[PDB]
């Protein structure tokens with residue numbers, strides 16, 4: 001072949017988002033990952049599970065990213081998972097999708113690849129538990145779990161409300177969803193993307 | 205005098221069997237009214253048939269009715285160390301209950317199942333997180349169940365809640381020891397529900 | 402008279418201690434609740450604690466054995482990289498005797514924490530819950546009864562898992578009225594539950 | 600030598616100690632991996648160590664400061680009610696200096712544990728991961744590469760989160776061939792990743 005000699009690592013940013021907050025974060029993660037020379041980055045969402053009429057009546061945000069299949073997760077060197085919280089877990093849509101990776105699991109297709117997580121909540125509560133409980137699933141697949149620690153200097157500033165934890169980037173949407181991701185939350189997300197992507201390139 | 209819901213998800217019947225022992229234990233408590241209900245299957249029916257999903261007798265619960273009980277005992281098989289998507293999808297539809305505080309202060313407790321043991325604890329504790337967001341009182345079982353001191357044989361069950369080991373191929377049935385722990389969990393939670401009423 | 406509540410804490414620079422007093426004040430609003438505050442023993446040498454500027458504290462030091470004398474224990478700890486502090490862990494490491502005799506079984510347990518920057522405040526509470534579970538304690542989260550948990554206009558601790566406070570990177574931040582109010586609710590709620598169960 | 604691996608453990612009755620040697624043995628299979636086993640200092644007074652009958656240990660004692668000298672650290676600890684041991688917690692509580700200078704950032708971390716009767720072996724590993732995360736370490740689970748994890752015909756430790764052993768309530772179980780083999784894999788896997796990252 002010789003098809004694509006310049007790509008060094010492939011990064012999938014896979015997310016679920018209903019009102020677009022994770023969607024916004026996923027784009028910042030991808031922007032950070034694209035800063036690594038040789039990192040090929042693609043954004044994909046998991047399929048919606050609620051009936052289309054019920055997504056419409058709820059005002060769900062239509063999204064441009066392609067819908068991911070479970071099988072193609074095996075094509076990537078690193079997967080960065082984004083999900084809103086549902087009472088301190090990942091969303092049902094993300095859970096249902098990951099529940100379909102059993103074929104990958106049985107063949108060890110995700111073993112040793114890099115995994116990393118970012119989340120969103122309305123009022124903050126559960127933002128850590130959501131990431132940490134997602135790591136468990138990465139572990140069963142044998143993925144290397146990449147936290148972000150305190151490299152992002154924004155994390156030392158507690159003068160304002162802001163998402164972002166050493167476990168991964170987060171954003172706070174507000175109870176009514178009106179809060180948009182801040183520059184500092186987006187800067188943490190970008191760091192997570194670039195950090196993971198650099199690691200994927202180093203491992204290849 | 206007290207009402208116990210045993211709410212479960214099951215594909216191959218292992219959780220279903222545990223749920224019946226949990227309910228059996230809960231029925232030993234005078235004044236406890238106990239009912240078993242399942243979470244709705246979410247996968248397409250042709251795929252459940254092809255996968256050999258087990259036909260089950262219990263009626264399906266709706267999300268709104270969780271508020272009618274004094275204690276809810278949640279059963280779920282593990283999916284990579286979480287509750288199943290089916291259980292997650294159902295609990296994701298309890299937001300109305302959450303906003304009105306309808307589950308607040310009620311007793312919640314959890315039991316699980318795995319193929320080879322791994323993840324059985326993470327499944328229970330990560331479910332507890334959701335119970336906490338609803339403000340439910342979280343009931344572990346500790347070491348009241350004496351089977352938990354015996355490590356001479358393969359046996360599910362943890363201080364966090366009852367568990368069973370199905371085997372990689374699903375062929376293992378819940379043992380007498382695992383069912384006894386599940387029964388204990390049911391009886392303990394129900395007695396607590398009666399005392400609080 | 403009707404229920405005995407222990408507010409058991411560890412504190413280095415006084416933030417948890419301040420939270421502990423608010424937790425106890427909340428529990429004291431329940432008629433019939435006897436509430437006492439105690440701390441776990443310091444583990445670092447006294448001279449090194451002084452050089453680090455540790456806060457001197459009046460509460461009596463608890464012993465492991467006396468935990469069995471209470472109906473509900475509300476545990477306070479600062480975070481150490483997302484767990485309970487070494488001091489608290491060392492203390493709970495001495496409760497195996499209570500574990501072997503089921504002395505804490507079925508009692509109410511509840512947790513509140515403190516961090517410099519928020520990160521880890523949830524993991525600290527939840528990983529403490531694990532220890533309470535091994536003792537068979539009934540775990541009491543607070544959910545969202547405290548309306549202060551809905552206001553994201555200002556930095557403030559408190560989670561559905563239990564009350565928390567944000568000390569700041571340099572520890573100069575004091576617990577806010579909203580953080581104390583969430584702590585007060587936690588105390589009152591747990592104390593109310595202990596009374597109902599007796 | 601291409602990478603330096605620290606196997607850092609705490610052990611009271613020798614179970615983690617046995618496991619730690621198998622972990623190191625696995626890591627020494629990787630060409631260029633320099634592997635050393637070290638223990639965290641005991642915290643209880645010697646008179647109480649004697650009455651509890653603690654098993655004396657030959658491995659050198661580690662300092663908090665030297666953790667920055669390694670490319671990968673594999674932490675072993677017995678469980679205490681579903682957390683890491685107080686001794687391990689106390690030791691890691693003194694890595695605050697390492698934290699402020701980012702000295703452990705990006706290094707590989709991995710965990711193995713021990714219990715009497717199984718319960719808590721997973722919570723001990725995952726709650727240890729939290730601390731590694733605050734330090735910005737890369738967290739290495741083992742997944743299901745070790746075939747022994749599919750065999751449920753006999754009592755056996757080991758999880759996708761890390762190797763474990765079951766000592767028995769009275770400590771009479773010694774780590775089995777299968778559990779040590781999982782531990783050997785963990786060491787070999789981590790060491791290979793450490794070499795690749797250098």
Ligand SMILES: Cc1cc2nc3c(=O)[nH]c(=O)nc-3n(C[C@H](O)[C@H](O)[C@H](O)COP(=O)(O)O)c2cc1C
Nearest residue numbers: 017018019020021022084086087120121122123124
């Ligand atoms: C079922 C359900 C449970 C929720 N649980 C929480 C929660 O525990 N904590 C929280 O802050 N927000 C919670 N929310 C608020 C959602 O997290 C919020 O709308 C979401 O993060 C928005 O992200 P998105 O635009 O990417 O969908 C919940 C929402 C629903 C619908």
Ligand SMILES: Cc1cc2nc3c(=O)[nH]c(=O)nc-3n(C[C@H](O)[C@H](O)[C@H](O)COP(=O)(O)O)c2cc1C
Nearest residue numbers: 214215216217218219281283284317318319320321
């Ligand atoms: C998507 C998927 C993920 C699974 N993850 C795990 C696991 O992490 N650990 C495990 O021991 N078994 C796992 N299994 C085995 C299941 O838990 C097992 O079939 C189940 O507990 C049977 O319970 P049931 O009869 O009620 O369905 C998994 C199965 C599926 C389909």
Ligand SMILES: Cc1cc2nc3c(=O)[nH]c(=O)nc-3n(C[C@H](O)[C@H](O)[C@H](O)COP(=O)(O)O)c2cc1C
Nearest residue numbers: 412413414415416417479481482515516517518519
């Ligand atoms: C060893 C150590 C580890 C710490 N880890 C964290 C942390 O993970 N997250 C955080 O926000 N603060 C952390 N801090 C900040 C302390 O948690 C903070 O000073 C404490 O909550 C103050 O409470 P106190 O006055 O009751 O001691 C840590 C401090 C030390 C000494």
Ligand SMILES: Cc1cc2nc3c(=O)[nH]c(=O)nc-3n(C[C@H](O)[C@H](O)[C@H](O)COP(=O)(O)O)c2cc1C
Nearest residue numbers: 610611612613614615677680681713714715716717
């Ligand atoms: C304070 C204390 C707490 C313990 N908690 C647990 C536990 O939660 N689960 C368990 O199986 N064993 C528990 N045990 C049994 C210990 O983990 C067990 O003896 C240990 O793993 C042996 O490892 P070692 O020889 O390396 O010390 C506990 C023992 C003590 C002293």
Ligand SMILES: Nc1cc(Br)cc(Br)c1O
Nearest residue numbers: 102105140319320371372
């Ligand atoms: N039996 C089984 C099946 C899947 Br898919 C994942 C795991 Br982990 C299992 O143990």
Ligand SMILES: Nc1cc(Br)cc(Br)c1O
Nearest residue numbers: 121122123174175299302
């Ligand atoms: N939007 C929203 C929904 C639920 Br359910 C819980 C919380 Br907290 C939220 O902020």
Ligand SMILES: Nc1cc(Br)cc(Br)c1O
Nearest residue numbers: 497500535715716767768
């Ligand atoms: N062996 C053992 C000792 C204590 Br103390 C607690 C537990 Br839980 C145990 O398994």
Ligand SMILES: Nc1cc(Br)cc(Br)c1O
Nearest residue numbers: 517518569570695698733
């Ligand atoms: N303030 C603070 C101090 C240490 Br040491 C660790 C963390 Br993480 C913190 O947030």
